[PDB]
Amino acid sequence: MWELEKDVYVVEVDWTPDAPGETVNLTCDTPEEDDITWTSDQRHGVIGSGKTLTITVKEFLDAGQYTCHKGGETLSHSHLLLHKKENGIWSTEILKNFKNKTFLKCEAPNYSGRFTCSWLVQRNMDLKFNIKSSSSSPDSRAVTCGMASLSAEKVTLDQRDYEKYSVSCQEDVTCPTAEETLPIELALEARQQNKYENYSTSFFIRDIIKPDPPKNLQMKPLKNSQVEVSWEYPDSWSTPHSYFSLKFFVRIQRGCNQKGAFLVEKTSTEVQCKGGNVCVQAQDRYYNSSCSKWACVPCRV
């Protein structure tokens, strides 16, 4: 057993059929020692007595809020969370993993240090999240995360729509241009009713980069079946652009889709369409990170 916060404890439990439950002592926060009575918010009536209550916690009915009493007045209460362990593996049942079998997915629009991480939930009910820097060493990368919020966007995997959550974070001290020598290690604590689980992830900001689509994609014809297309770097992207260079792929219509797109490092090109869309996306010139969303415009005069 271990303390999560004031008067909230987590109990690790082996979830095999014939497992011996953990015996946990819960003492009352009062100077008195007589006429002490205990109750649970999962059971009817008095379930114990004595200043210290000793119980065997195996099932989830053995969890919850245990309340003290003396002479009809309440005294204190302690909360029990369960951390399931089955076949040697810690449970991961509150969150739904993405197609790539990861649970936490983070992406950053630039190298400033700000980024967001997101996850999916199997059932959006009675949830409590909290995310922070897992490693707390001096040579760790300090991060200041916000509070988790339910997002309007709903990811659809298999034939099910999962609600997604998200949280924005900022790296404390930064030098965008500097090379990253060690990763950002994060940890999400997840609760659902009286179930406790936790998810961890490590990453370099360079690997999670995904620029925003190029802005001001304008049109200008040239001759029969030819048109010059121009654009400019997005406002979100890191500055100066001479250092944080970008490359672009250009495809035609009728992550990184490289089926029939041609590379252009400059911010303009000449191409033939005369019917259909001319779409262009961006990527960091020097590192193979995630590409941007497509920015499309028709091919009409």
Added chain:
Amino acid sequence: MWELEKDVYVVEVDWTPDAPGETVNLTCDTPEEDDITWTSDQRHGVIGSGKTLTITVKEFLDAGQYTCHKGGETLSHSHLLLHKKENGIWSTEILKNFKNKTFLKCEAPNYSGRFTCSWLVQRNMDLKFNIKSSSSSPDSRAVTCGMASLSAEKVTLDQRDYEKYSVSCQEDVTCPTAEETLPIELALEARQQNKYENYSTSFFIRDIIKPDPPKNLQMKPLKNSQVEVSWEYPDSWSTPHSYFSLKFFVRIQRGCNQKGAFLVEKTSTEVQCKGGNVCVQAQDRYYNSSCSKWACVPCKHH
């Protein structure tokens, strides 16, 4: 007098003819107090006695290793180095200054933070060098230098060729784009026998930059007395090249010389030669730092 390291002390001395030497007390590192005697590695026999030896240090014979003894066994020893001061000036006799009358010359091939400093020596014998960050304040630039090594190259000044030393250094913390707001202040300690001197220098890495010569200098003709010459930035140079841009000068034949060289910011040009060499050197586009070495290459029927 002041301590350089454990049991090694430096004595500042005015080297005018009739100068009063500095009196220095040397105590023994032992709990005993009787039968204590002193010797020197510059003098024969016992030169003193008592737990504390008091001597007048003026000449170099008064320097060296002073050893402590009791009952035939050695106890401890202290080393004395001399720092000469003549006409108010601290001596600079171990090192030979360059043509520009400086002693330390540093150069960097890129903005990484790595660089090297070099110096010359008048006589390569019984030398000990050590270089470090002179200022040790919080707002100073921290540097981690290596060990000084004798170089194969020998600079030739006047009518004599002098042996050269060099040491590579790295600036602890770096930010590629960042502007340098204060310089890198270094200090070299030099010893030769029992003589101590020290040399200092301050610089911004941007000022010591000297790129390496441009690589893959290929040729491709055009017409009678016309030919296109192309090259590419050197591998040592900082990246990305869109930020760390370079300039190039192109001269003809038959450390920026630029006597008859013409500027080209792009990595190629068309020029007339039809006989001779076409040489090209590089420089940082935006700062007037040192230029690179030259990269040279030579130049019927219907």
